[PDB]
Design a protein around this motif. Structure first.
Motif, PDB file in Angstrom:
ATOM      1  N   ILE A   1       0.862  -1.196   0.000  1.00  0.00           N
ATOM      2  CA  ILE A   1       0.000   0.000   0.000  1.00  0.00           C
ATOM      3  C   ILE A   1       0.904   1.254   0.000  1.00  0.00           C
ATOM      4  CG2 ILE A   1      -1.565   1.330   1.392  1.00  0.00           C
ATOM      5  CD1 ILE A   1      -2.879  -1.355   2.296  1.00  0.00           C
ATOM      6  N   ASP A   2       1.901   1.318   0.872  1.00  0.00           N
ATOM      7  CA  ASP A   2       2.845   2.475   0.946  1.00  0.00           C
ATOM      8  C   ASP A   2       3.539   2.694  -0.414  1.00  0.00           C
ATOM      9  OD1 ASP A   2       2.267   3.498   3.407  1.00  0.00           O
ATOM     10  OD2 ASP A   2       3.627   2.133   4.437  1.00  0.00           O
ATOM     11  N   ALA A   3       3.990   1.641  -1.083  1.00  0.00           N
ATOM     12  CA  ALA A   3       4.626   1.773  -2.427  1.00  0.00           C
ATOM     13  C   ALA A   3       3.597   2.315  -3.411  1.00  0.00           C
ATOM     14  CB  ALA A   3       5.168   0.457  -2.884  1.00  0.00           C
ATOM     15  N   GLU A   4       2.349   1.870  -3.330  1.00  0.00           N
ATOM     16  CA  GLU A   4       1.295   2.368  -4.223  1.00  0.00           C
ATOM     17  C   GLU A   4       1.102   3.853  -3.955  1.00  0.00           C
ATOM     18  OE1 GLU A   4      -0.996   0.122  -6.689  1.00  0.00           O
ATOM     19  OE2 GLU A   4       1.169   0.221  -6.621  1.00  0.00           O
TER      20      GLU A   4
ATOM     21  N   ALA B   1      -2.177   5.296  -5.208  1.00  0.00           N
ATOM     22  CA  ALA B   1      -3.187   5.203  -4.117  1.00  0.00           C
ATOM     23  C   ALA B   1      -3.156   6.466  -3.267  1.00  0.00           C
ATOM     24  CB  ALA B   1      -2.941   3.987  -3.288  1.00  0.00           C
ATOM     25  N   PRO B   2      -4.314   6.952  -2.811  1.00  0.00           N
ATOM     26  CA  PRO B   2      -4.366   8.165  -2.006  1.00  0.00           C
ATOM     27  C   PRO B   2      -3.945   7.920  -0.561  1.00  0.00           C
ATOM     28  CG  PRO B   2      -6.540   7.240  -2.181  1.00  0.00           C
ATOM     29  CD  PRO B   2      -5.658   6.400  -3.093  1.00  0.00           C
TER      30      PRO B   2
ATOM     31  N   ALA C   1      -1.505   3.050   6.683  1.00  0.00           N
ATOM     32  CA  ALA C   1      -1.434   1.849   5.838  1.00  0.00           C
ATOM     33  C   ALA C   1      -1.514   0.608   6.720  1.00  0.00           C
ATOM     34  CB  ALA C   1      -0.187   1.867   5.002  1.00  0.00           C
ATOM     35  N   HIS C   2      -0.865   0.625   7.880  1.00  0.00           N
ATOM     36  CA  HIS C   2      -0.726  -0.581   8.715  1.00  0.00           C
ATOM     37  C   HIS C   2      -2.079  -0.917   9.365  1.00  0.00           C
ATOM     38  CE1 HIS C   2       0.703  -3.315  11.859  1.00  0.00           C
ATOM     39  NE2 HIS C   2       1.643  -3.630  10.934  1.00  0.00           N
ATOM     40  N   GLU C   3      -2.876   0.104   9.673  1.00  0.00           N
ATOM     41  CA  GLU C   3      -4.196  -0.101  10.302  1.00  0.00           C
ATOM     42  C   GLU C   3      -5.163  -0.614   9.218  1.00  0.00           C
ATOM     43  OE1 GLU C   3      -4.967   3.664  12.219  1.00  0.00           O
ATOM     44  OE2 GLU C   3      -3.208   3.432  13.586  1.00  0.00           O
ATOM     45  N   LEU C   4      -5.123  -0.045   8.015  1.00  0.00           N
ATOM     46  CA  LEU C   4      -5.960  -0.522   6.875  1.00  0.00           C
ATOM     47  C   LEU C   4      -5.611  -1.987   6.568  1.00  0.00           C
ATOM     48  CD1 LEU C   4      -7.858  -0.181   4.503  1.00  0.00           C
ATOM     49  CD2 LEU C   4      -6.061   1.117   3.332  1.00  0.00           C
TER      50      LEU C   4
END
Ligand SMILES: COc1ccc2nc(-c3noc(C4CCN(C(=O)CCC(F)(F)F)CC4)n3)sc2c1
Ligand SMILES: COc1ccc2nc(-c3noc(C4CCN(C(=O)CCC(F)(F)F)CC4)n3)sc2c1
Lengths: 187, 187
Positions: free
Chosen positions: B126-129, B135-136, B141-144
């Motif tokens: 997610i962080d790389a996206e 990605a917005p 990211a870790h909680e999602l």
């Protein structure tokens, strides 16, 4: 009632240790009654937990019915918050009740009955949102509702138990609301 | 190995009944060894299940590592499908292993170790996206990642067990992929 005293004692002791480590004698003692007198109100410590869980799920269910007699993000947040606050106010009963699903058919069936009811209510609201043009016709509403409700069950209860891993309890409502709103309204 | 014969017998018997209703004698018999010979390989039927679960989670984990050495919807679908196929190919072990989380600290700790690893890998993607602008920057990211991974755990395992309620197994991949893509890319 002696009945209400047994229930309150059981809820108190479940804050300290699991049902396995609570005796009928502990429950009787806390409730100010003898052991045989206990068996007049409940056949087992398992029945006490079943009753405590039934009251908690009914309290959540009545609170959701209350909402339902009346912005999209705030609507879903208010609805998820019924479960966050209600179960969050009864963590020991919630935790012991979820564990008892594995060993009590009555506990498994209560939890399954209410999950079907809350999934059906979620799907009906998604369908109304679709009918009014506020939400796109993406997945089948009942299948989306099922996964989102299972997410909430697992995520709420992991957070309340402080499991590793879990969302911190102070972040769990924002987390679930984001996933509900983006998946219901998105694409 | 006699070891591999015990593991295969245990996986076979877990298709018919739970671990509680399988004796060390059933395992020895199926494996073509005596009871004391069984105790040479494993201290208990519980250790057999722990080993079977360890192999299954390692197979999923190695399959995800394989993907990771190389459209956004198809990427998440391929990744979720590692778990759908791997656990879906070992339903009896998956089911018995999930139940054993309640009664075995070693089973609880294995499951928790791999969930933390898969959540950390999800959050990194997610962080790389987010870094690449695909990605917005919405939730942490870790909680999602935690909530989406807990959703998948609960939803996959309810579907495989045919629980009421559950997403039908033939709909569960599409359901999870929709919720992952809309929540990661949405708003
Ligand atoms: C005044 O206007 C309003 C305000 C709020 C509002 N919320 C509504 C709603 N529909 O469905 C649900 C779900 C129930 C299951 N749910 C759960 O999280 C279940 C948790 C579990 F028990 F599953 F673990 C999450 C909300 N909420 S309609 C409505 C109308
Ligand atoms: C070739 O290019 C690709 C292709 C696919 C691909 N998938 C990726 C990925 N990152 O994180 C995850 C999750 C792991 C946990 N996960 C689970 O469902 C865990 C299920 C559970 F064990 F939690 F129950 C769901 C996918 N997948 S990166 C990648 C790169």
């Amino acid at each position: 009632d002696r009945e209400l005293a047994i229930l309150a004692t059981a809820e108190n002791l479940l804050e300290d240790r699991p049902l396995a480590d609570i005796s009928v004698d502990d429950l009787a003692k806390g409730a100010g009654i003898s052991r045989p007198t206990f068996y007049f109100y409940f056949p087992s410590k398992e029945a006490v937990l079943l009753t405590l869980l039934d009251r908690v799920v009914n309290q959540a269910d009545m609170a959701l019915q209350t909402l339902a007699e009346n912005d999209r993000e705030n609507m879903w947040r208010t609805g998820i918050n019924v479960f966050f606050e209600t179960f969050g106010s009864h963590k020991a009963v919630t935790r012991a009740g979820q564990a008892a699903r594995a060993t009590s058919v009555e506990v498994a069936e209560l939890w399954s009955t209410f999950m079907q009811k809350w999934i059906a209510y979620t799907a009906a609201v998604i369908d109304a949102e679709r009918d009014r043009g506020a939400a796109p016709r993406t997945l089948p509403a009942h299948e989306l509702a099922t996964a989102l409700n299972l997410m909430n069950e697992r995520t709420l209860f992991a957070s309340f138990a402080g499991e590793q891993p879990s969302v911190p309890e102070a972040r769990v409502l924002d987390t679930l609301v984001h996933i509900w709103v983006t998946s219901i309204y998105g694409e």
